[PDB]
Symmetry: D2
Subunit: 293 residues, 4 copies
């Protein structure tokens, strides 16, 4: 089984002004991550990919392009989760047939599902696809907060490999490491990569790695090497850039910094604001000069 | 235009064990609401309809059947919102062509959309379809809370008629009545019908009206006539029933209650637990006996 | 025991520039309430009285003054709750000795107390004083939310008379009226008096009744007769006033509105901002001319 | 100026059955911390000391005893915060008079104070005592969250030394280190010591150091030496112990664990449940056996 540890960018997608996928740009974002950011893999179709604003056919298109462009150069995880479990199975099977290395699914959201319902959800996607599974936990958007005993129940299925922890509860993260030492953890908060790596997370899945991939690998590797002082300096610089990106508008600022690298990262998909304002373009240029030149 | 005030059932949908729509059963639920519950209209494709777990074609299928079964006997409101704005627009056009009386859309969820983007979403649906719109507010599931000034901005669009207020903030409720006297308000919390009718809401859109339509009508009409002691008594009985329904499982218990009236309400759609347990079936029968016999 | 239903002003207290109690001003506030606002009673030492920023001796002084000035003109409730249960008991005994008609106690705060702990706290204050008790709900300032079954457990003590309900949950409100018909409810949200009265609350305890008692009484009395539209016109004006009071700073604005009636309501007690700026004073003068002249 | 970095136990207080202070037991808790736990200091009068359920004279007693028993053997911080700002100044001056090294104050709670009000509160305690101050973050009990800009304003006063950070926001933690490099940060989450130490916190104030002082020092210093794998092993044993402590009831379990060391840590002060049950006692003895023997 292809190794899933390390540094994975959460793949941003380039959209045309009309909301349709810009394939040429998306291939450029992919090439930049693989060739310039030097990531170990791509995490395709997650919240960062503007996934939940798209139809099933568009989701399939993005998975088709990403796999054809990356080929076997890097590891690929397919995020196929959704409120629609039939859609999730459908998408899981499609990515599996394409050769994705592993599936991932957000906890079903909107409705307040019970834990058994969440569990059936994960077990079904695995049983209908035959693929391995990474629980995608992002409580800030889902409102789903699972405790240590519930992760143990999910882990009864041997195809559940671990969790993409897009949450800042570092006690729970240590508890997960203690209770399930053979299960993987990927940090989801780029601006807290140092403290997550201090507790032994196995990798990181991040939206800022599309542009800050060099620094993110250094933080990860220096921290695992016991060079905390060195990692902290690079996490400080990284956070000045992340703070700017958050203040200027996460999605649009990453796409604008990508455009400054010559990648046609396009526009955001509506209902997200699709076009950067003047001021937003100005700020991106400034972040570029200060932190990525 | 068709009158949109009064008592509206939020239509539940009958599903087969495999998750496909049971058309025959759905037509039975529809007839029950019109013929026995004596509703003024149906609210199709809401949360209650298990709408966010379905594919776009399934949503069009439910809209088609509901319109074909109901024809022009009662008022029909089509809930077409989603995280996908292109899908909302598609569904909005579809229901418009079918002849629904007005559309409605949940505030875009999952991503934390800004107010301007939420207003754009509503204005886009309106521009693309040409239909009137009822803002669908359900903070408990969406996490979106809008204050009085934001409602005013949404109301600058003359096609916005008002709001389905599925929240229990009665100060905000009075503020809306005070500030926008020409805009309608439909109460969305069945167990708080009396206090909402004491502030003059124009109607009620509710899931328990599928089985407790006679009492709901009474509470609403008795409150408007100033008969608060008589209304409260019926609200008390109604809330014993709702407390039982909520304790036993809202979706499955309304469905099991419909089955005791000989309506083939079927199962719930996965990720929701699809079949009721033996305890759930027994509790429904006991509620049937106690409150709807 | 004395009748405790009706309109109760949550007594505000007059402080000097240095934070000490201004007795003459406090007596003027009491007199304005009894003689002009025509209240049924006063609720003394509650949050509105700036009670939790004071020492025990100050709370005792306020109790002494208020009983001395009101004599037996109106009903008097004494809020004696605290995080210190020994202080609660001392204050409960003191107000009992003075002739307060009943006590009240906020749910113990700061620490996260269990329900058995909260119930023991109320049972102890009652046992050590021999007085009747009004329990709370106020979750906005305590973060303590109790359910129907927890109120039942508190109501096993025959000296608990009911609850001061300062939380907007009208479902819980109707459930309390259903299960405990002989237990009293006082609404604590002045901007939601109408809908609370619509469900038969027995009275209301509010901070705005120190200046708007006339209207508060009308809303209550009109709602009770089923004259909803007339009550609502008075609730609408009342909420324009309240909206203005809330935006300008609640405590200082009610005190500035009292000063415009010739009542020396003085300053607020630090940590709260003690002095109203020039813009706050002007806004209160405007509110007085528009709504209280 | 005495060095305030390192390991501080948040001092538990021994109470008699009647809620009064057990002086003899309190001196024994102090002696165990200093001589066996080998702390660098004690944090006296904080939430862990049950301070908020006590009278002003009891707080004073505890400061007197603590200083008399510890003398100048270790650093001593006095927590003097309260909803009552006059009480905060009185305690601040008393502890300054006793020769405490630095003061601390929780953010004023119960009412929702504004930032200027909180800053005024801190600036008043400092002006009135002449002592240094450690501010708080602590959102779980107070509900007050503050950002870099506001810490900036607090830090304009040169007598503010830094912050006792008791909520786990590691992004805010790094940003604080970045913006204000010379300002100190004491971690307040014993179960997240490792990640806090990886970001360079200056020390830790913890309730569990009263019994697990030795492992707390090792985590802190190994982490600072970049020996993360060894650090993590001790954090994992520590967290098994804290998980057990938390499940059994924090305050009572640390006191029963001290009793097993020959310390008369006595009872909790009402409203907290004052005496441990047979099951709580037995679980403490089991935790002692597995983790502290």
């Amino acid at each position: 089984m292809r190794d899933l540890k390390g540094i994975f960018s959460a793949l941003l997608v380039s959209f045309n002004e009309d909301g349709t996928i810009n394939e040429k740009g998306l291939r450029q974002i992919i090439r930049h991550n693989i060739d310039k950011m030097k990531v170990d893999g791509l995490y395709v179709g997650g919240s960062t990919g503007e996934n939940f604003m798209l139809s099933t056919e568009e989701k399939k298109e993005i998975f088709r392009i990403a796999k054809d462009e990356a080929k076997d150069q890097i590891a690929l995880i397919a995020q196929v989760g959704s409120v629609n479990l039939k859609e999730a199975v459908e998408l899981g099977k499609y990515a599996t047939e394409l050769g994705y290395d592993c599936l991932s699914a957000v906890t079903p959201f909107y409705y307040k599902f019970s834990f058994p319902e969440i569990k059936h959800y994960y077990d079904t996607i695995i049983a209908e696809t035959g693929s391995n599974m990474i629980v995608y936990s992002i409580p800030f958007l889902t409102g789903v907060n699972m405790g240590i005993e519930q992760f143990g129940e999910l882990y009864k299925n041997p195809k559940v490999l671990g969790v993409k922890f897009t949450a800042g509860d570092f006690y729970l993260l240590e508890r997960l490491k203690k209770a399930y030492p053979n299960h993987l953890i990927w940090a989801g908060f780029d601006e807290m990569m140092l403290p997550a790596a201090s507790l032994g997370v196995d990798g990181a899945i991040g939206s800022t790695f599309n542009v800050n991939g060099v620094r993110a690998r250094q933080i990860f590797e220096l921290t695992k090497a016991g060079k905390l002082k060195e990692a902290l300096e690079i996490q400080h610089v990284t956070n000045d850039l992340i703070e700017g990106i958050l203040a200027n508008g996460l999605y649009l600022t990453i796409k604008e910094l990508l455009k400054l690298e010559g990648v046609d990262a396009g526009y955001c998909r509506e209902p997200m604001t699709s076009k950067a304002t003047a001021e937003q373009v100005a700020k991106a240029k400034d972040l570029k000069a200060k932190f990525l030149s």
